Amino acid sequence: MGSSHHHHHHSSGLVPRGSHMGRMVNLEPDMTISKNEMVKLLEATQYRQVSKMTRPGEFTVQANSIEMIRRPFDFPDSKEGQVRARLTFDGDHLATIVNMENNRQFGFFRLDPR
């Protein structure tokens, strides 16, 4: 058990408010994204937010960004080494991504949804 955030009140009959799944992965700065869009990124890095992360298959969603560590994934379209990426929101919408190792700018971080 690590970073166990409780208070999971399921919306039994989520008719109002609208659809809120969001599941979207294509990291491309100046995109309008959420923990719920990147959620898939997070399901992709197969992780859940941490106070602090560093291992393959993590991320952090806390303040202005959704960070991440690409665990080795065996996808035909995506199979590489680990990367710490900084998905920084202009508040509501992702503005930039930064390679947290070099602190260089992104503008492409592509995942393979699943």
UniProtKB/Swiss-Prot annotation:
Localization (cell): Cell inner membrane
Q: Which residues form a coiled coil?
A: none
Q: List the cysteine pairs that form cystine.
A: none
Task: Give positions of region: UvrB domain 2 homolog.
Answer: 23-114
Record's subunit section: Forms a trimeric complex with MipA and MltA. Has also been shown to exist as monomer or homodimer; homodimer of Alpha and Gamma isozymes can be found. Interacts with UvrA, FtsL and FtsN.
Give the protein's biological function.
Cell wall formation. Synthesis of cross-linked peptidoglycan from the lipid intermediates. The enzyme has a penicillin-insensitive transglycosylase N-terminal domain (formation of linear glycan strands) and a penicillin-sensitive transpeptidase C-terminal domain (cross-linking of the peptide subunits).
Further information: A third isozyme, Beta, lacking the first 25 N-terminal amino acids of the isoform Alpha and a fourth isozyme, Delta, have been found, but seem to result from the artifactual degradation of the isoform Alpha and isoform Gamma respectively.
The text of the family note is: In the N-terminal section; belongs to the glycosyltransferase 51 family. In the C-terminal section; belongs to the transpeptidase family.
According to its record, what is known about the domains?
The UvrB domain 2 homolog region (UB2H domain) is important for interaction with MltA.
This chain belongs to the protein called: Penicillin-binding protein 1B
Please report the organism this UniProt entry assigns to the protein.
Escherichia coli (strain K12)
Q: Which gene encodes it?
A: mrcB
